[PDB]
Homo-oligomer: A and B are copies of this chain.
Amino acid sequence: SDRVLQLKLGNSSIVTQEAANICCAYGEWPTYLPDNEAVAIDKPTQPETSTDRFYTLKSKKWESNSTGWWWKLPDALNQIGMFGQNVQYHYLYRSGFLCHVQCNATKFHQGTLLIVAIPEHQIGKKGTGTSASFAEVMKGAEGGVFEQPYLLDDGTSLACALVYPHQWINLRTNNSATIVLPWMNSAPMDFALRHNNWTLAVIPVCPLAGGTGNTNTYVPITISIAPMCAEYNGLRNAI
Is the CB–CB distance between B85 and A235 below 8 Å?
no
Q: In whole angstroms, how far apart are the Cα atoms of A44 and B11 in the complex?
A: 11
Is the CB–CB distance between A43 and B47 below 8 Å?
no
Q: Does A81 contact B (CB under 8 A)?
A: yes
Interface residue stretch chosen among A48-56, A118-126, A161-169, A172-180: A48-56
Q: Does A82 contact B (CB under 8 A)?
A: yes
Is the CB–CB distance between A45 and B44 below 8 Å?
no
As for how many copies of this chain the complex holds, the number is 3
**Residues from 9 to 45 in A contacting B, C-beta threshold 8 Å:** 10-11, 42-45
Q: Does A72 contact B (CB under 8 A)?
A: no
Is the CB–CB distance between B42 and A50 below 8 Å?
no
Q: In whole angstroms, how far apart are the Cα atoms of A86 and B83 in the complex?
A: 11
Residues of B within 8 A of A47 (CB): 45-47, 50
Residues of B within 8 A of A183 (CB): none
